[PDB]
Every structure is written in structure tokens, then in C-alpha cells.
């Protein structure tokens, strides 16, 4: 028994019936900072709703430990066969409804619902709120749909010490018996699944937007564990965060909705941040307590962007149902990118965009499981693992797209139009295109049947011809039909650019752009014709669309031999891109990616690479082409080449600079020879240093965990490891260093906590499974083939889908490409599985599938 799976047509009878008007929820929490025995929270609603047919039933939602007392207009309802799968419910309404109900609700270790943490450094215990599908039952009783929006009015009564945020500003006062009440204002209205509850000792920053144009001041917090607070970059992320105010009200026409923004660093958090309206939380990760490169800091900025973005996106104007998810996440990533480059340092983010969210996308697209952007939901097992590479990445990529295609301008004039018409209400896709039309003009109704609602990617290369001068005498764009899918071919406004030695550097520069319109099967450029061909065309130039852009035979030769020559990031991360692409495609042999991405030189492949996000991202593309993609005659000595090319770029490079732990942080990550692991111990202990590379507290778990993986250091280093980082911290990173011990004995108690032990919190589980595979010990790994696909339907059926996903994602067996994989995962797909169970199986399956294909395609 669980928590109810509430299906599209169910959501919609509620809505149909059911206008909720307000909810008022005291919790008692005067108990939570007791220890780690404390299980139940007092939990009181009182909801104000409307019924369009008085004497029809109903129910509302709860997940409950107990349900003391239900009482709908007065009238008190036999709970006595209360359980969390059928809520309470809720007979002969009236046109005007308030039911009470007590309950006590369960604390969770599982960052779902009110999730409770004990900090083992000083004792202070943190609470915070995870809502975001279908959890808030879990905290209140409520209609838990998005469409049934109300007002919050919030009050809690809590220990002492803790600091409490929620939704809205508040007045505190002592109780005089140890504990302080803490009334929220009545919140604007919003979907149940943005409330927020953050509770605890936390470190507390304070910073104001000042008010402009028309924009209300904004007072603004931040929030932290005590234990990290010394760690914490406040003032960095103010002056982040007042450059995303600044930007979204100007290029939205709509100040920011709420009164006031607090930002909330939380332990244990499942997601990298959640768009609670007015108290965003985050992953812990982004408290940087040890030194991280510049890539880092820009994908914090990107999230703290996204999440800000989400207050318009998806907070002021929520999507009618799960299946225009899409509306909230796709929108947030496109502004967060736009954001960055407009108003922030990181004005290079569409060349990170390209290079790393992209190819999320692409991957996402090209599994079974593919859907349009504007996806199918038939109930909230769907949505659970739907939050995905086409939900987000390809989705601000149609999104990037659509803005080319009608022009910033009237884009955000048809947002202007969208988020009025809608706020405080739900949406839908006809909704959004409807405002797009109007501010534009244009019919888009086919624009979103081509882009919107298909599956698959077009492929996009030059066809051309020459003259005796090297002038173009022809060319056009040919466009594939779009695969996987339906085979169409779209519109896309793109642009091409043709790039040749600049003569003063040597290095590659545009020379020409043009750009266009391209339909149909094919499309001529005839103000192309008689221009240089140059050394390099580039059909997706300044990556406007989305497509799998190729090359034509000359341009792939100096992709090949010069990459590193392009001066501009964008063109030249886009070739990084293609090669990538091209072998996953089986178009380009595995040990040419390898080679390319090795070089030969100091000027040569990724080491010359001056973009850190993206040095960063090919070398992790790289390990997959050796581990996946290589024939596994060649993996040897393809591992023994990068394991050596990556020393010497270690050694090679600047000391203390990102560079240089990023070539180390790939080493880690890597199957490595005695000379590696020789120096890698050097580094960790000190005896024999990396110049410039400061070996700080997570760098010395990251080089500790090689070593293990290695069989270089065991429980007895890892134990000892974990008495000098004595922090909730250090527990996971010694977690994963367990999993990593190369024994079967290490492996099989590894397997048995991470499958079955349900006391363990969220991250310390996470972290066994991070822990679990290594590149190193395939065949240590292969004793789990058939333990995977025999024991993943019974954790399916015990834990919630967001906390089964880890361990059906994580211990599929990707390191076993092989015929016989498939063909068992081929007999456990012809049995009867859950169909998101099934969903993600496949996409395993597909994955191993892929890698076949490759190594046949490397193989010479
Ligand atoms: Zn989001």
C-alpha cells in the first residue's frame, strides 16, 4: 500500500467538481528536534472549497501515520479505514465547503514530503520540504493536482533555535514553554506542490533587490546548515541572484510575483533545486566547501537562474496537468541560458548549453521511450520519470529554435500576453501558442505540430560543389526525415557559416554567414554561390536549431585534423559536439574520438581546450567511448593511452588552475597503471606533490577513491579517511569508497544496501550505487546481470518510483555489452511489468544495444 497513483481523468473530475479556495495549516513541531526515534509531526488543515453539485462525493489527499479527527461542514467522517492510498473521503458536499482534519504525518528520510536530517557535527537537526510531484499529502491535507490552486496561510510551532521559512514573510512569537510560533502570511494563490517548510538552525544571510521600474523591493535570504556555514559564498550569490532580477522583469514585462526570496541550502536533497515559490531549495553540492573549477560556478548560476526563472515559469502560471510540464521546465532552462548571457559574467553559456544540455537531449530523443516535448501523461507514475532530457534540454532547444524562427522580440511580447492572460491560473500548449500567435502575427498551429508534438531529431549536412578556385558553383542544406519518429521534415532557421585560416594566427575564422529558412527535403543558398568554400561549413552555425548537424567530407578532414585551430568557443565546442554525436552514431570509430580528444601536442585535442565546461565534458564522453564504444580488444590499450595522456596533461598544466584538477579529477575517474596510481598516492598523502594542486578535503576522498577502485588503499584507509572529515559529508563519500572495493564480498554487501536497506536516508543509499561501478571492475560487475533484472521488480514495488529510480538507473548492467544482455532483458521484457519500470528498463536495454553497434564500428 502506498500513496495514491492519481490518473489525468480522475484529476480532471476533481477539477471539474471541486474550486479550492484556501488552506490553513498549523504543524507542531514542537517535538522535531527530539532524536532520531521522533517518527510523527502534528499536521492540521482546514480547506476552504467550493462544490458545482452540492450532494456529489469526493476526496481529498493525505499520507498519514494517524488520522485523529475529519470533520467536512461540522459533520464528523468515520475515518476508521483511513489508509494514505485512498485519502479521506468526502461525502454529500455542500456549494460551500470547510473540512478540518488532525493528523499526525511521518517525518522522511527519503527527501520526500517533510524531510528530517541530524547533523552529526553539532546536533542540529534540519528539516525541509519536498512537494514537487504528488508529496504534499505527505505534509497537509489537500487536493494534491496542480490545477486546483489556492491560497496558503501557514503556521508552525517549532523548537527554539530553528529559523522557519516558508512560502511568505511571517511574525514569530515565543510560546513561553521552549518552542516559538511562527504565523506566514496568507501566500498568493499557487499549486499544493510549491508550498514550502524549511525548519532548523540554519545560517542565515540577508541581502535586498532594491526596488526598480516598476519592481518592488526584494528582500532576499539565504540559508545553510551552521556546520557549512564558513563555506558559503553569500555575497557571490546576491549579486547572482539581483542580476536575475533585474533581467526577468525587464525581458518579461511582469515584476517578480511574490514578495520576497529566500534561497535555501538543504542536506539530503534528491534534485539539484526546486522552484518553491519565494523559498527555493538546493542541493548541498552547491555549497562549495572545497575548491571546484569554474564550471562549477556556472552551473550553480544556471540553476540559481532556472529556479528564479520557475517563479514565472511554472509558479505564476502552472501547467493544467503533468503532461505541459514541459511548460514549466523547458521555459525555465531557455531563460535561464538567456539570462546568464544577458546579465551575468557567464556570457559563454550557449556554448555550455551546446556542449553538455544538448547532448542530453539528443541521448533522451533517441531512446524507445522518446516523446514529444508536449508528452502524454496518463497518471503520476508517468510524470515520475518523465522529468527528463526532452522534458528539459530538448524542449529549450525547441524553445531557442521557436525565438529564431519568430524573433525575440515578438517572443517575449507573446510571453508578455501569455503570463497576464494566465496568472494566478493553469495553462496549457494551445494556451501558450495562442499568446505566441497574437504577439507575432503568425499561425503556429503547424509549427507546433512539426516541433511540439514529434518525436526524433533531422539530420542537417551541406551538399555541395566547387569550381577550379575553391568558389561554391551549388549548395544546399539536406535535411533527413526525423528519427526515431514519425519522418518528417520541419522548418528551421538556421544559419551557415564557412570558416578558413585567418592569415595573421593561422587559426580558423568565419568568413561568411548566411542565414535562412531551411524546409523540406532539401534547400538551396544561392547567395552562397560563388563564395569560398574555405576549410570548414557549419549548417547549424551559432547553434540556432535542433538537429544532428554533419559535415561534408573535406570540412569532417579539417574537423579531424585542426579542431583545436577554431578560434571562436561556440563553432568549435559544436565540433567537439558532431564528433561525439558521430560516434555514439556509429559514424566516427570510437579510438578517432579518443584520438582527436588526446591530441599529440601542446596545441593539439582537449588539453588545448580553453573552455573548462568543456574539457570537462568531453573527457566524461571520452571514459564512455573507452568503456562502452571501443572494441573490447582495444579497451586496454585505448584506457593505457588516455591513463598516460592524462598525467602528462596533469603535470603539463598551469599549477592551481582549473586545468589542472580537471585533468586530476579525470584521472580518478579513470582505469589506471601502476605509474598513475604511484602518483596519484603522492598527491594524496603529500609526499610527492602535484605542483599548485591543492589536495583539500573532497579532493583527497576523489584521489581516495581511485586508489580503492584500484585495490591500492582499503577499509582500513577509508575508515581513517572518515575520522579526518567527520561530517554527514564524509560518511556518503566513505559510502562510495566501500562500493568501490574490488572483492566480490565488498560488491555483494554493497548490492544488498543499496537493494534493500530502506533505514538508510536517500543520500547514503545514492551514494552505495555511485559507489557500485567502475570502469576497472567489469568483471567483478558481470555476477549482476541476472541479479538485476530478477530482483528489480520487487524494489520497484517497495519503494516510491523517485527512490526506486536510482537503483533501477544505477545497477542496470551498462558495463555488460553483450548479445546476451539483450536477450535478457528481451525475456524479462515479454513478462508483465509496471509500465515506468518497463519504461526504464528499456532504455537500458537500448543503451547496450547502442554500444553494440559502436564496437562493431570500431572494430578493425
Ligand atoms: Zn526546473
Not at 520487487?794 to 545497477?811: F, K, N, Y
Request: contains cysteine; proline residues 4%; charged residues 25%.
Amino acid at each position: 500500500v502506498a500513496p495514491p497513483n492519481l490518473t489525468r481523468e480522475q484529476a480532471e473530475q476533481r477539477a471539474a467538481l471541486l474550486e479550492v479556495q484556501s488552506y490553513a495549516i498549523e504543524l507542531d513541531l514542537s517535538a522535531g528536534a527530539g532524536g532520531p526515534e521522533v517518527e510523527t509531526f502534528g499536521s492540521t488543515t482546514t480547506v476552504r472549497f467550493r462544490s458545482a453539485t452540492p450532494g456529489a462525493e469526493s476526496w481529498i489527499d493525505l499520507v498519514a501515520a494517524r488520522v485523529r479527527s475529519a470533520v467536512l461542514n461540522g459533520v464528523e467522517l468515520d475515518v476508521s479505514d483511513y489508509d494514505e492510498s485512498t485519502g479521506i473521503r468526502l461525502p454529500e458536499l455542500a456549494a460551500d465547503n470547510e473540512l478540518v482534519v488532525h493528523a499526525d504525518c511521518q517525518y522522511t528520510n527519503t527527501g520526500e514530503g517533510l524531510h528530517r536530517f541530524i547533523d552529526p557535527v553539532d546536533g542540529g537537526v534540519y528539516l525541509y520540504s519536498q512537494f514537487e510531484t504528488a508529496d504534499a499529502k505527505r505534509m497537509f491535507t489537500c487536493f494534491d493536482q496542480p490545477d486546483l490552486k489556492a491560497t496558503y496561510q501557514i503556521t508552525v510551532t517549532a523548537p527554539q533555535d530553528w529559523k522557519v521559512i516558508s512560502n511568505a514573510a511571517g511574525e514569530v512569537t515565543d510560546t513561553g514553554e521552549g518552542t516559538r510560533r511562527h504565523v506566514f502570511d496568507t501566500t498568493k494563490p499557487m499549486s499544493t506542490y510549491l508550498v514550502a517548510l524549511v525548519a532548523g538552525p540554519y545560517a542565515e544571510w540577508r541581502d535586498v533587490f532594491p526596488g526598480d521600474d516598476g519592481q518592488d523591493e526584494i528582500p532576499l535570504g539565504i540559508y545553510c546548515r551552521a556546520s557549512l556555514a564558513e563555506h558559503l559564498d553569500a555575497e557571490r550569490l546576491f549579486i547572482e541572484t539581483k542580476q536575475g532580477f533585474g533581467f526577468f522583469h525587464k525581458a518579461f514585462g511582469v515584476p517578480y510575483p511574490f514578495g520576497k526570496y529566500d534561497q535555501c541550502f538543504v542536506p539530503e536533497f534528491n534534485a539539484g533545486a526546486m522552484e518553491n515559490a519565494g523559498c527555493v531549495t538546493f542541493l548541498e553540492d552547491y555549497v562549495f566547501r572545497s575548491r571546484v573549477t569554474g564550471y562549477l560556478y556556472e552551473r550553480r548560476s544556471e540553476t540559481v537562474l532556472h529556479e528564479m526563472a520557475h517563479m514565472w515559469f511554472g509558479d505564476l502560471v502552472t501547467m493544467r496537468w503533468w503532461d505541459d510540464l514541459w511548460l514549466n521546465e523547458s521555459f525555465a532552462t531557455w531563460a535561464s541560458v538567456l539570462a546568464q548571457v544577458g546579465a551575468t559574467q557567464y556570457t559563454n553559456a550557449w556554448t555550455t548549453f551546446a556542449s553538455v544540455e544538448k547532448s542530453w537531449a539528443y541521448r533522451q530523443d533517441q531512446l524507445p521511450s522518446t516523446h514529444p516535448v508536449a508528452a502524454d501523461i496518463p497518471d503520476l507514475q508517468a510524470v515520475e520519470v518523465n522529468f527528463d532530457g526532452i522534458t528539459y534540454a530538448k524542449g529549450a532547444s525547441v524553445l531557442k529554435q521557436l525565438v529564431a524562427y519568430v524573433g525575440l522580440e515578438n517572443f517575449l511580447a507573446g510571453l508578455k500576453v501569455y503570463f497576464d492572460r494566465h496568472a494566478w491560473g493553469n495553462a496549457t500548449l494551445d494556451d501558450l501558442l495562442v499568446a505566441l500567435e497574437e504577439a507575432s502575427g503568425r499561425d503556429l498551429s503547424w509549427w507546433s505540430a512539426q516541433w511540439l508534438q514529434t518525436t526524433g531529431l533531422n539530420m542537417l549536412r551541406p551538399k555541395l560543389a566547387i569550381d577550379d578556385e575553391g568558389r561554391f558553383t551549388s549548395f544546399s542544406v539536406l535535411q533527413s526525415p526525423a528519427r526515431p519518429g514519425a519522418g518528417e521534415h520541419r522548418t528551421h532557421r538556421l544559419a551557415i557559416g564557412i570558416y578558413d585560416d585567418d592569415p595573421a594566427t593561422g587559426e580558423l575564422v568565419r568568413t561568411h554567414r548566411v542565414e535562412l529558412d531551411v524546409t523540406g527535403e532539401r534547400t538551396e543558398v544561392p547567395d552562397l554561390v560563388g563564395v569560398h568554400r574555405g576549410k570548414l561549413v557549419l549548417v547549424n552555425d551559432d547553434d540556432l536549431t535542433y538537429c544532428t548537424m554533419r559535415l561534408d567530407p573535406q570540412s569532417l578532414a579539417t574537423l579531424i585534423d585542426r579542431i583545436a585551430d577554431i578560434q571562436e568557443s561556440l563553432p568549435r565546442a559544436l565540433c567537439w559536439s558532431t564528433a561525439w554525436e558521430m560516434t555514439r552514431e556509429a559514424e566516427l570509430k570510437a579510438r578517432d574520438f579518443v584520438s582527436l580528444v588526446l591530441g599529440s601536442s601542446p596545441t593539439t585535442g582537449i588539453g588545448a581546450e580553453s573552455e573548462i565546461g568543456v574539457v570537462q565534458r568531453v573527457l566524461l564522453q571520452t571514459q564512455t567511448a573507452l568503456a562502452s564504444y571501443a572494441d573490447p580488444a582495444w579497451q586496454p590499450e585505448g584506457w593505457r593511452r588516455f591513463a598516460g595522456r592524462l598525467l602528462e596533461l596533469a603535470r603539463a598544466a598551469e599549477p592551481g588552475s582549473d586545468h589542472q584538477l580537471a585533468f586530476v579529477n579525470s584521472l580518478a575517474g579513470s582505469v589506471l597503471g601502476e605509474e598513475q596510481i604511484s602518483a596519484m598516492r603522492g598527491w594524496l598523502d603529500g609526499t610527492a606533490p602535484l605542483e599548485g594542486l591543492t589536495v583539500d578535503t573532497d579532493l583527497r576522498w576523489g584521489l581516495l577513491q581511485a586508489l580503492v577502485a584500484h585495490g591500492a588503499a582499503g577499509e582500513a584507509e577509508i575508515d581513517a579517511e572518515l575520522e579526518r572529515d567527520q561530517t554527514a559529508t564524509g560518511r556518503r563519500r566513505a559510502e562510495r569508497a566501500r562500493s568501490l572495493i574490488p572483492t566480490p564480498e565488498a560488491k555483494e554487501k554493497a548490492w544488498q544496501r543499496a537493494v534493500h536497506d530502506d533505514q538508510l536516508p536517500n543520500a547514503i543509499s545514492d551514494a552505495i550505487i555511485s559507489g557500485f561501478q567502475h570502469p576497472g571492475q567489469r568483471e567483478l560487475l558481470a555476477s549482476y546481470v541476472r541479479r538485476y533484472f530478477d530482483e528489480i521488480d520487487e524494489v520497484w514495488h517497495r519503494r516510491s518510483s523517485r527512490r526506486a529510480q536510482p537503483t533501477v538507473i544505477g545497477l542496470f548492467p551498462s558495463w555488460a555489452v553483450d548479445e546476451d544482455t539483450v536477450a535478457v532483458a528481451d525475456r524479462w521484457l515479454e513478462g508483465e511489468h509496471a509500465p515506468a519500470l518497463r519504461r526504464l528498463v528499456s532504455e537500458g536495454r537500448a543503451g547496450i544495444v547502442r554500444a553494440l553497434a559502436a564496437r562493431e564500428f570500431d572494430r578493425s
